[PDB]
Amino acid sequence: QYSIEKLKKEENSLAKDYYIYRLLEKNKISKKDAQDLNSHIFRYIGKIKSELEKIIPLKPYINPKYAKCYTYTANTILDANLTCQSVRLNSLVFIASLNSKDRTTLAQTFKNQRPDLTNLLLAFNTSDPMSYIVQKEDINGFFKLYNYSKKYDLDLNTSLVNKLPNHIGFKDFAQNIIIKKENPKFRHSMLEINPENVSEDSAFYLGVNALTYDKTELAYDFFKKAAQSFKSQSNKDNAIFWMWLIKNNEEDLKTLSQSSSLNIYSLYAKELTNTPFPKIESLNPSKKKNNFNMQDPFAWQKINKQIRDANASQLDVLAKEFDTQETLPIYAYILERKNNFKKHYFIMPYYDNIKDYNKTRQALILAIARQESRFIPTAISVSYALGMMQFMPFLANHIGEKELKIPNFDQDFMFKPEIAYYFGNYHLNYLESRLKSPLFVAYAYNGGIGFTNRMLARNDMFKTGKFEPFLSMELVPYQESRIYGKKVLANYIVYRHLLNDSIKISDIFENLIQN
Numbered sequence: 042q043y044s045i046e047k048l049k050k051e052e053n054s055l056a057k058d059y060y061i062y063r064l065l066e067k068n069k070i071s072k073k074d075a076q077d078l079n080s081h082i083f084r085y086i087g088k089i090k091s092e093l094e095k096i097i098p099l100k101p102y103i104n105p106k107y108a109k110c111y112t113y114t115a116n117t118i119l120d121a122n123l124t125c126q127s128v129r130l131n132s133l134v135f136i137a138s139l140n141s142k143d144r145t146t147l148a149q150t151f152k153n154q155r156p157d158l159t160n161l162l163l164a165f166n167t168s169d170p171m172s173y174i175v176q177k178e179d180i181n182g183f184f185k186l187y188n189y190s191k192k193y194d195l196d197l198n199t200s201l202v203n204k205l206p207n208h209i210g211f212k213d214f215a216q217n218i219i220i221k222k223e224n225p226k227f228r229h230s231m232l233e234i235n236p237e238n239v240s241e242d243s244a245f246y247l248g249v250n251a252l253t254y255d256k257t258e259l260a261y262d263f264f265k266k267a268a269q270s271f272k273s274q275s276n277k278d279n280a281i282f283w284m285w286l287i288k289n290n291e292e293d294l295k296t297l298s299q300s301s302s303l304n305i306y307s308l309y310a311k312e313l314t315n316t317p318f319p320k321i322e323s324l325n326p327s328k329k330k331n332n333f334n335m336q337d338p339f340a341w342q343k344i345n346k347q348i349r350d351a352n353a354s355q356l357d358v359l360a361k362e363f364d365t366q367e368t369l370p371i372y373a374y375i376l377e378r379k380n381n382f383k384k385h386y387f388i389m390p391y392y393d394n395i396k397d398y399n400k401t402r403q404a405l406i407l408a409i410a411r412q413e414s415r416f417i418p419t420a421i422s423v424s425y426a427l428g429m430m431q432f433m434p435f436l437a438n439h440i441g442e443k444e445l446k447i448p449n450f451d452q453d454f455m456f457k458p459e460i461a462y463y464f465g466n467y468h469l470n471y472l473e474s475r476l477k478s479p480l481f482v483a484y485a486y487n488g489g490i491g492f493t494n495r496m497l498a499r500n501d502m503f504k505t506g507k508f509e510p511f512l513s514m515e516l517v518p519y520q521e522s523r524i525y526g527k528k529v530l531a532n533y534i535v536y537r538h539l540l541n542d543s544i545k546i547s548d549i550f551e552n553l554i555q556n
């Protein structure tokens with residue numbers, strides 16, 4: 042327990058934020074303490090923000106240049122000068138709140154200078170503003186209306202849909218309606234997007250979309266364009282896997298099996314082609330200890346800032362300094378950045394705490410820890426998940442106090458490897474018992490067993506099918522969980538291998554198909 046005066050002498054960081062949040066939820070931050078505190082918050086988003094605002098609410102902020110513009114309402118906007126009228130018409134809710142005659146008057150005012158406003162003003166004089174905006178092919182208006190309400194759904198012709206990808210909002214638009222299975226008329230219309238007009242994630246998601254309609258030839262073209270444009274090798278591998286699954290061109294599978302990225306797609310391709318398992322680095326530092334305190338979360342924030350802001354000369358001196366058994370997690374963290382992510386590091390720190398579990402469970406624990414924290418004992422996420430296993434504080438207190446009844450339990454115990462591993466094994470036992478597959482366990486570990494059960498109970502998710510289970514893995518409705526599951530599954534395959542408990546990744550996929 043650090044007092045608010047001690048914390049103010051620490052660097053702004055997620056760890057300092059976390060401890061400020063702890064004072065706040067304990068009601069130990071007075072109104073006078075809170076005055077200068079917004080400057081002490083590394084990330085003023087989310088629960089620390091709403092908690093601090095129960096003490097000192099911010100009424101801010103309106104730009105003093107446009108202050109007079111917000112003293113008007115729908116009833117008096119025709120009294121406002123021209124600049125205030127245009128300012129207030131940035132909000133589609135404001136536009137919707139006007140009456141028809143005023144929208145018509147304002148539409149005439151702006152048809153010259155701001156035809157975008159005119160189109161929206163007149164769209165809202167109809168029973169379907171989206172249909173009006175689609176007929177004008179007003180791309181900016183289309184996305185403002187989509188952001189205003191997802192409920193609009195409408196068929197879009199070839200000319201219109203091929204103009205949508207040029208807008209910054211298109212990637213999130215397409216991802217959202219495809220992985221949530223919403224706006225079917227939008228989704229069906231995006232079959233007509235020319236692959237030349239999209240790239241990267243947008244092209245990949247349009248390939249997934251094409252597969253849901255069994256347009257395999259259009260899907261192949263989208264995935265090929267994604268493969269040729271993706272920046273990261275991992276994503277490119279994902280896209281090449283789909284090219285192979287659709288057309289079985291064995292040069293695609295060959296490229297996938299030779300990839301430098303270690304992921305489930307390249308692992309699967311290696312297995313399908315009798316290609317040997319990729320080389321895993323071996324890290325056995327001869328030195329045993331140094332000065333660094335692996336239980337000080339402020340020291341980790343400190344050194345993590347340095348490492349992420351180093352050239353090479355600094356990386357090399359850091360690598361040498363943390364080349365000890367004690368700081369093995371930081372050593373492998375540095376080495377991963379030093380080698381520009383081209384080498385594969387799969388350490389097993391604090392191994393005594395798990396060496397007595399069966400090797401399959403050890404692999405799942407290690408796979409989770411690697412993805413969650415890179416084995417940093419004092420890791421703190423932006424929602425204040427804690428320690429190597431990144432336990433959310435609520436779940437950690439339920440287990441620590443109500444289940445395991447640990448004497449004098451504080452949530453900061455999660456920063457201890459033996460607690461993190463013990464709690465992670467305990468929690469994984471709960472999830473494995475309900476879900477079986479390590480993939481599903483991964484989804485529920487990251488996103489809770491709530492949405493996993495909801496997703497598994499749908500009849501279009503991880504059932505049998507031409508492209509299953511791979512298609513379902515692309516349609517997991519939360520992007521974070523979708524990615525997390527693929528990454529943890531790869532880690533799990535690797536660790537089962539290093540533990541001499543190898544498993545064929547093809548067996549993992551067979552078990553995902555519920556019959």
Ligand SMILES: CC(=O)N[C@H]1[C@H]([C@H](O)[C@H](O)CN)OC(C(=O)O)=C[C@@H]1O
Pocket residue numbers: 413422424426430431432433436468485486487488489490
């Ligand atoms: C073991 C555990 O705590 N799992 C939790 C997970 C985790 O904390 C996070 O993935 C760390 N990055 O977060 C959430 C969440 O919806 O916030 C749900 C899970 O119950």
